[PDB]
Amino acid sequence: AHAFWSTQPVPQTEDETEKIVFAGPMDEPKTVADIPEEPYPIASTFEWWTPNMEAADDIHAIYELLRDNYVEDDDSMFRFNYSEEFLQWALCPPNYIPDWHVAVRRKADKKLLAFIAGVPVTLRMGTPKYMKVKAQEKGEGEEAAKYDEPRHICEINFLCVHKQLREKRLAPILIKEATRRVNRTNVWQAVYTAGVLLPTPYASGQYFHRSLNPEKLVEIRFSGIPAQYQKFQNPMAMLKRNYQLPSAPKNSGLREMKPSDVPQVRRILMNYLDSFDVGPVFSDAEISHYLLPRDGVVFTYVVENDKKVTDFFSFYRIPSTVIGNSNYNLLNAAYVHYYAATSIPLHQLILDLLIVAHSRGFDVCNMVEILDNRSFVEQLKFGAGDGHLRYYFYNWAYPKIKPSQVALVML
Numbered sequence: 291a292h293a294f295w296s297t298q299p300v301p302q303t304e305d306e307t308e309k310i311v312f313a314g315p316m317d318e319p320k321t322v323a324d325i326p327e328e329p330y331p332i333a334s335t336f337e338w339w340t341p342n343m344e345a346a347d348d349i350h351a352i353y354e355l356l357r358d359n360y361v362e363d364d365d366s367m368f369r370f371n372y373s374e375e376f377l378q379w380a381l382c383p384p385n386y387i388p389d390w391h392v393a394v395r396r397k398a399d400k401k402l403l404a405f406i407a408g409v410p411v412t413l414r415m416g417t418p419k420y421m422k423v424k425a426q427e428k429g430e431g432e433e434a435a436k437y438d439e440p441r442h443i444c445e446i447n448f449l450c451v452h453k454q455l456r457e458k459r460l461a462p463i464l465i466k467e468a469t470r471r472v473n474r475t476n477v478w479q480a481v482y483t484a485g486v487l488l489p490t491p492y493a494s495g496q497y498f499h500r501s502l503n504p505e506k507l508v509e510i511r512f513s514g515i516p517a518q519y520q521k522f523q524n525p526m527a528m529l530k531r532n533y534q535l536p537s538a539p540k541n542s543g544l545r546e547m548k549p550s551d552v553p554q555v556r557r558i559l560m561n562y563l564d565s566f567d568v569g570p571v572f573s574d575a576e577i578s579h580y581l582l583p584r585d586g587v588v589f590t591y592v593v594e595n596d597k598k599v600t601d602f603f604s605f606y607r608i609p610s611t612v613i614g615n616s617n618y619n620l621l622n623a624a625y626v627h628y629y630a631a632t633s634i635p636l637h638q639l640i641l642d643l644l645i646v647a648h649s650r651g652f653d654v655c656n657m658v659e660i661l662d663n664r665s666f667v668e669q670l671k672f673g674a675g676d677g678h679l680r681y682y683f684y685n686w687a688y689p690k691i692k693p694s695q696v697a698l699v700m701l
């Protein structure tokens with residue numbers, strides 16, 4: 291049923307996952323020395339390629355492969371369109387490893403045909419809290435804590451095979467060669483997410499959307515007018531009214547984040563992310579990289595009164611291509627990123643997120659039900675979308691957890 295995934299060090303079924311009680315590796319410990327020095331064999335018409343991301347033309351080639359061939363919704367109406375500026379930001383965090391960005395080009399023309407990217411992440415991934423309770427009841431605390439310390443692993447994203455190359459078992463060859471390159475740097479675990487079911491997730495969560503520009507959403511058929519609104523003389527006018535927002539933020543000390551805020555934002559974020567079983571650990575340089583505002587890419591605001599940063603939120607932009615509509619070419623979506631509240635309720639902090647995103651011209655705000663994203667779904671008028679996002683590890687046994695125990699945002 292799975293010719294590739296059945297050969298890989300991942301839990302194979304749900305009931306296998308069910309017998310997992312401690313975090314730890316699936317496979318045999320291995321060394322760099324054991325790993326083949328040479329690239330995995332490939333068909334003689336293709337060649338491996340390592341793009342240079344601090345070079346404009348290389349970023350542009352991967353930008354076009356993704357523009358034309360990356361994730362679509364299920365009836366081919368929208369396709370993600372990550373910008374070039376976004377891709378440099380996402381692929382090049384501090385101390386990234388250039389050879390973990392893995393491409394396949396056609397030899398004859400150098401046309402990009404496939405891509406996969408890995409980046410460093412420091413991740414807490416020790417036995418979850420509920421399994422530590424079950425462990426103490428059994429007398430098994432030591433085995434439960436063996437992998438408690440944060441691990442330097444790989445986060446995978448941007449797997450893409452050209453449309454003309456689909457269903458030829460190319461994705462396995464990409465994944466094998468990524469795994470070899472990661473293993474050649476003495477890294478043995480990866481974390482990845484997908485909107486498809488594979489063997490075998492450790493957590494799953496629904497998608498959620500908050501309409502900001504409802505007349506445009508209905509026009510492009512992102513949204514419909516729901517049935518209930520027909521009882522009204524003017525269904526659309528009442529839909530606009532339901533989703534209207536203030537013009538300016540409600541929290542008085544709200545302002546954009548600046549370099550001097552890095553230490554306080556790091557502090558309050560890390561204190562918050564501690565409450566979750568699987569969560570990233572960020573250095574000052576990584577807080578700077580992922581949170582300081584960047585035009586058209588990432589937007590981050592702090593609440594400061596009395597010269598302390600006590601709360602913040604962030605969101606990132608990804609436009610999607612509207613696969614041809616007469617009036618509109620692009621859906622401009624804002625995605626909830628990291629946040630922390632210490633002085634005001636989480637709903638009151640995120641309302642300011644919606645208000646900023648709306649004033650800056652975003653059409654919809656999107657998020658998965660990770661972190662504490664549930665505490666504000668009803669009052670802030672988010673709705674559940676279609677399907678689920680699934681979270682996975684590579685070479686890591688892990689007890690099933692709820693998505694509200696997951697704190698890793700995947701860009």
Ligand SMILES: CCCCCCCCCCCCCC(=O)SCCNC(=O)CCNC(=O)[C@H](O)C(C)(C)COP(=O)(O)OP(=O)(O)OC[C@H]1O[C@@H](n2cnc3c(N)ncnc32)[C@H](O)[C@@H]1OP(=O)(O)O
Nearest residue numbers: 292293294295448449450451456457458459460461472480
């Ligand atoms: C220690 C370091 C390790 C690092 C690596 C860790 C693992 C990283 C894993 C990657 C995490 C990526 C996270 C993301 O970026 S999720 C985003 C994935 N990208 C898209 O959905 C973009 C549009 N679609 C495509 O570009 C292609 O359809 C892709 C590339 C997805 C598949 O290409 P194609 O359709 O031409 O198929 P094939 O004949 O070549 O290959 C068929 C095999 O591929 C398995 N398949 C299908 N979809 C996925 C998927 N999303 N993750 C893992 N495997 C997937 C499938 O079950 C089958 O195996 P098996 O069932 O026969 O066994």
Ligand SMILES: O=C(C[C@H](O)Cc1ccc(Cl)cc1)N1C[C@H](CO)[C@@H](c2ccc(Cl)cc2)C1
Nearest residue numbers: 361447448483484485497498656657658700701
């Ligand atoms: O899991 C990932 C990264 C993964 O390798 C590739 C992927 C891209 C899109 C989707 Cl659909 C699923 C998986 N995501 C990237 C998406 C954009 O940041 C993010 C998302 C958030 C909220 C909504 Cl409502 C929809 C999507 C999920």
Ligand SMILES: [Mg+2]
Nearest residue numbers: 457458459460
């Ligand atoms: Mg293929």
